[PDB]
Design a protein around this ligand. Sequence first.
Ligand code: ADP
Ligand code: ADP
Ligand code: SF4
Ligand code: MG
Ligand code: MG
Lengths: 289, 289
Amino acid sequence: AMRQCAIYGKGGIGKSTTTQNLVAALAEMGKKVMIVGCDPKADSTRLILHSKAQNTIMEMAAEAGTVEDLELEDVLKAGYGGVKCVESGGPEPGVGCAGRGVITAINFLEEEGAYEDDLDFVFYDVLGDVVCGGFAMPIRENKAQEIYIVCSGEMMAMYAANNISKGIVKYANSGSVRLGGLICNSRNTDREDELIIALANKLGTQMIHFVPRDNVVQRAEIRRMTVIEYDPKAKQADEYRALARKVVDNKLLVIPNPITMDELEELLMEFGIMEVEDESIVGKTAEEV
Amino acid sequence: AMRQCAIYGKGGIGKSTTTQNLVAALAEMGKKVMIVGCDPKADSTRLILHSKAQNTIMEMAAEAGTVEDLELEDVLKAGYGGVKCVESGGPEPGVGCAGRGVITAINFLEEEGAYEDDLDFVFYDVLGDVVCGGFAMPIRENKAQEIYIVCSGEMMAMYAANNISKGIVKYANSGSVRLGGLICNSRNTDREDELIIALANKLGTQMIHFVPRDNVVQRAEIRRMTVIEYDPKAKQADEYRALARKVVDNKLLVIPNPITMDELEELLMEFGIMEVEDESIVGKTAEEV
Ligand SMILES: Nc1ncnc2c1ncn2[C@@H]1O[C@H](COP(=O)(O)OP(=O)(O)O)[C@@H](O)[C@H]1O
Ligand SMILES: Nc1ncnc2c1ncn2[C@@H]1O[C@H](COP(=O)(O)OP(=O)(O)O)[C@@H](O)[C@H]1O
Ligand code: SF4
Ligand SMILES: [Mg+2]
Ligand SMILES: [Mg+2]
């Protein structure tokens, strides 16, 4: 019954907008969901709770002494459609390991029985520019079985998607963490949809949805909510409902086949983002060739 | 003589293009320089060496058993204008700490006498989406005295700039590492130049150059070289020469003043990137407000 999922990806590609809107769509489907924010920007639960960045486990532990002094209901707050929201937080920019807050947050929620509520889904919203501390921990330990990567038709997004796939490959013997699919969040680049379908096919997964870039997202967010609550009858609202329907129905959970930097560049070259290169003109100035 | 500098920023803002073009301009004006790539994407020296991703210390020490059997000329390669290039590399994407290569690379380079050359400058090219392990090590230990943050007029770029600034503030009593300035690498957004001037003033630093988005960069990069080498007469080349003049002559090295996330959003509202929001619309639907 209960399925633990995780939305990984590059910084600023759209995983908090996508996770909060897909989760809000699962709420109006009758599913009880929990979002666990695993990005040091603590704004992964803003739109569900109608708030400024939610108080994190890290901040509340620091005000109370330690995590031993916290109560689950002080940390886990309910919002739109009853989805329960928590934020990990993490170390200050100078110190330690930036992903440490994710390890102490999942361990607290386990000890406090947050997963033993009547949850249909858990969605971890995790930073994916670096795949290594508590950021790699939903994969390394068997916490998030279905990984969906939000990316777009640019090098860093696709590079991040490929590296997250290599982390899934590394622990594939250790548990049941598999790649569920790729979510192309549109930047309105020309053959973008086709390029993420092609990357997906190289990795052995699918592009489970192409989310359009729509301004209703901004209009919904100054009111501090998801599009699903702001304009339930917007075009974009049905785009998130459709992503929610396909994630619920999805059974393709694979061990991905990560590609090389060459095959990644060749993907962008085939789809016209990067321009074609040849070895003859390599190292030669503008006036020579 | 030798000044140690580090270029930080969010993934994909253009700190490898900016650092190689800037160093190529420095070699073109007689300065002896070394680039230490401190980003797990190992392509920070591509354009100087006319190559694919340069063999990292991490790769070479892995297929050799230890870092003891590595020779300095296998690791440090000279290219355009005599600038020496070394790549740190990084662990496999689900293991260790993504910044470990930076710690073993700099300690190898110190022991092997790479800083005892008559170098005028050293540039570290560093991943700034997380400021925490080997990534934080140029600041934590007093390695790079002058930090220049490449950023743009969108939230993640400015967020990373502020967090790197907090990193510098955390180790201010420990050494001489200060923020030298901000480098706006253009996304062709309207009042972006003014926005980063105003972020910089808030931080107590300067926008030491506005780098324009120019396609001659993509034409130079398929030839696998810098604009400084490919077309020295093009407009973008005189833009990287201007930035290099201002870095050689920069004497503003400050302990920055990090702003709050509210103040960051108010900056994006004031320059028309993010839209204006009040608390009377917060929480209400499309059909109400
Ligand atoms: N489909 C979309 N249409 C419009 N704006 C979007 C869309 N998806 C995301 N955004 C905007 O992109 C930026 C980053 O989204 P966010 O979800 O915060 O990214 P990330 O959590 O991965 O850091 C914000 O302006 C967000 O509102
Ligand atoms: N001034 C510029 N004009 C045009 N394209 C640029 C410019 N600076 C960087 N780029 C492009 O931006 C992308 C990222 O640059 P890069 O320096 O590799 O980023 P980062 O080192 O921060 O990961 C590539 O397409 C690069 O060629
Ligand atoms: S393990 Fe990752 S998040 Fe932690 S200190 Fe290292 S690079 Fe930073
Ligand atoms: Mg987010
Ligand atoms: Mg780079």
